[PDB]
């Protein structure tokens, strides 16, 4: 059982998520 | 059992999600 | 059992999702 | 048992999903 | 048992889905 | 323009969905 | 324009969703 | 424009969602 | 433009979500 | 523009979320 | 007289998991 | 007279996990 | 007379985990 | 006379974990 | 006469963990 | 000699939104 | 000799929003 | 000789928002 | 000789917001 | 000889906000 992962990212301008996990509620009652 | 994954991304301008997991509720009651 | 996956993406301007998993509720009660 | 997959994408302007999995509720009660 | 798959896509302007899986509810009660 | 809807449900044991909207990806690349 | 909706549910044991909206990714790359 | 909604739920034992919106990633790279 | 919503819930034992919005990542890289 | 919402909940034992918004990462790199 | 809807549910028994 | 909706739920029993 | 909604829930029993 | 909503919930018993 | 909402909850019993 | 796959994409132009 | 896959993408131009 | 995968991406130009 | 993967990305230009 | 992975990224330019 062997798992290998490789990631290479190049970003000029970032306004969002890269390799990220985001949670937002924004709920209304 | 062997799993290999490779990722290469080039982004000029990012406004969304790249290799990301996002959750948004935006619910209304 | 062997699994190999390769990904190469080039993006100018991103407003959505690339290699991403997104969840949105936007429900109304 | 061997599985091989290769992906190459070139995107100018993205407003939707590329290699992505999206879920949206948008339900109404 | 061997499975090989290759994908090459070139996109100018995207407003929908490319190599993507999308789910939308949009249900009404 | 008038819309009227009425729902009545009686459930002993639930393992699935009742009056629900579910989305599952379970995709593989 | 008028919309009226009524819901009545009785549940003994719940393991799933009742009047709910659920999203699950469970994707693999 | 008028919208009216009424909900009544009786639950013995809950292990899932009632009138809820849930998001789960559970993704793998 | 008028919106009216009414909710009444009775719960013996709760292990999940009632009238709630939950987000969980549980992602792996 | 008028919005009215009413909530009434009775809980014996609570182990989860009632009228709540919860976020959990639980991610792994 | 009914000009709307009448829904009746009656269950006699027990639920065991 | 009913011009709306009437919903009735009656359960006689016990729930055991 | 009802021009709205009437919802009635009656449970007779006990819940044991 | 009801032009709104009427919600009633009645539970007779105990909850044991 | 109701032009709003009426909510009633009645529980007879005890909760034991 | 090819026993696999060869995919070639060539685009000459510009994309304007 | 190729027993796998070769994918080539070449774009000459500019992207303007 | 290739028994795996070779992916090449070449972009000549500029991105302006 | 490749029994794995080879990924190459080349971009010539500038990004302006 | 590659039995793993080789990743190369080259960018020539500047980023201006």
Residue numbers in the entry:
A (entry chain Q), B (entry chain M), C (entry chain I), D (entry chain E), E (entry chain A), F (entry chain B), ...: 9 to 37
K (entry chain D), L (entry chain H), M (entry chain L), N (entry chain P), O (entry chain T), P (entry chain C), ...: 21 to 37
What does the paper say about this structure?
Human islet amyloid polypeptide (IAPP) is a 37-residue polypeptide hormone that is co-secreted with insulin from pancreatic β cells and plays an essential role in glycemic regulation. IAPP forms amyloid deposits in the pancreas of >90% of individuals with T2D.43–45 A single genetic mutation resulting in a serine to glycine substitution at residue 20 (IAPP-S20G) is associated with familial, early-onset T2D.46,47 Recently, cryo-EM structures of IAPP amyloid fibrils assembled in vitro for the wild-type (WT)48–50 sequence and IAPP-S20G48 have been determined, as well as those of patient-seeded WT IAPP. Here, we used cryo-EM to determine structures of amyloid fibrils at different times during in vitro fibrillation of a disease-related variant of human islet amyloid polypeptide (IAPP-S20G). Strikingly, the fibrils formed in the lag, growth, and plateau phases have different structures, with new forms appearing and others disappearing as fibrillation proceeds.
Upon initial examination of the cryo-EM images for the 22-week sample, the fibrils appeared similar to those at 6 weeks, with almost all fibrils displaying ~36 or ~48 nm crossovers. However, 2D classification revealed that the sample at 22 weeks is less polymorphic than at the 6-week time point. The increased proportion of 4PFLU fibril segments enabled the structure of this fibril form to be solved to 3.1 Å resolution. Low-resolution maps confirm the presence of the entire U-fold from residue 11 in the external chains of this fibril structure. The L-lineage fibrils undergo a similar trend, with two distinct 4PFL forms found in the plateau phase (4PFLU and 4PFLJ). For example, 36% of the dataset shows 4PF fibril structures in the 22-week plateau sample compared with 11% and 0% in the 6-week growth and 3-week lag phase samples, respectively.
